[PDB]
Specification:
The protein has helices spanning 21-27, 35-56, 61-67, 82-92, 102-108, 150-163, 178-183, and strands at residues 95-98, 116-120, 125-131, 134-138, 146-148, 167-171. It has 190 residues and is of the alpha+beta class. It has 2 domains: 1-33 and 77-190, Cathepsin B, Chain A; 34-76, Orthogonal Bundle (Helix Hairpins), CATH 1.10.287. A 6-stranded antiparallel beta sheet has the order 1-6-2-3-4-5, with helices on both faces. It catalyses: Thiol-dependent hydrolysis of ester, thioester, amide, peptide and isopeptide bonds formed by the C-terminal Gly of ubiquitin (a 76-residue protein attached to proteins as an intracellular targeting signal). It is found in: Nucleus matrix; Nucleus; Lysosome membrane. Residues 6-185 form the Josephin domain. GO terms for molecular function: ATPase binding; cysteine-type deubiquitinase activity; identical protein binding; K48-linked deubiquitinase activity; K63-linked deubiquitinase activity; ubiquitin protein ligase binding. Its EC number is 3.4.19.12.
């Protein structure tokens, strides 16, 4: 044991702090992404998600299901669409979908049941990553790694859910980062 994970909780090498792309880089355990791509990814997502859903028929439901997400396409004042992460996630291997979805939750979808959750507040949104065995908020409003209890993460999402609705469930393959090491895997290994 490292004795204290918080000792160095965060993303190793970070070269892109401005938009959520930062949290994404940390979440992905490694940047390797630019802001320009986010804009293009978001745009491509709209065109892709629009055509993909439109073409596939989106069974309409898929439309109303996703539509739940925040529109506005995206900004350029220092923020990117959360959907951009989804596009990168999908292309990364994993996928990102809205959690609010009462259909999934009812079917049996828990907030903690996941590994990576995303929250959106009005405009600005944050990225939640499950570090070790607990959820940790990452963005900037937390002024750092805000440890969120399993009973809190769900309670929190519930609060935001009841307050409005802006949560995205990250499903798929999630890479490990420094936090993953703090969980157990110590540097010593060679």
């Amino acid at each position: 044991g490292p004795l204290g994970s918080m000792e160095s909780i965060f993303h190793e090498k970070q070269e892109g702090s401005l938009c959520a792309q930062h949290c994404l880089n940390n979440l992905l355990q490694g940047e390797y992404f630019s802001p320009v791509e986010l804009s293009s990814i978001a745009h491509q997502l709209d065109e892709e998600e629009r055509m993909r859903m439109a073409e596939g028929g989106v069974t309409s439901e898929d439309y109303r299901t996703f539509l739940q997400q925040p529109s506005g396409n995206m900004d350029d004042s220092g923020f990117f669409s959360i959907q951009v992460i989804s596009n990168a996630l999908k292309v990364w291997g994993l996928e990102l979908i809205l959690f609010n979805s009462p259909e999934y939750q009812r079917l049996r979808i828990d907030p903690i049941n996941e590994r990576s959750f995303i929250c959106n507040y009005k405009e600005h949104w944050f990225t939640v990553r499950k570090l070790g065995k607990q959820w940790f908020n990452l963005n900037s409003l937390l002024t750092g790694p805000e440890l969120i209890s399993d009973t809190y993460l769900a309670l929190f999402l519930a609060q935001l859910q009841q307050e409005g609705y802006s949560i995205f469930v990250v499903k798929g393959d999630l890479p490990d980062c420094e936090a993953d090491q703090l969980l157990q895997m110590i540097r010593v290994q060679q």
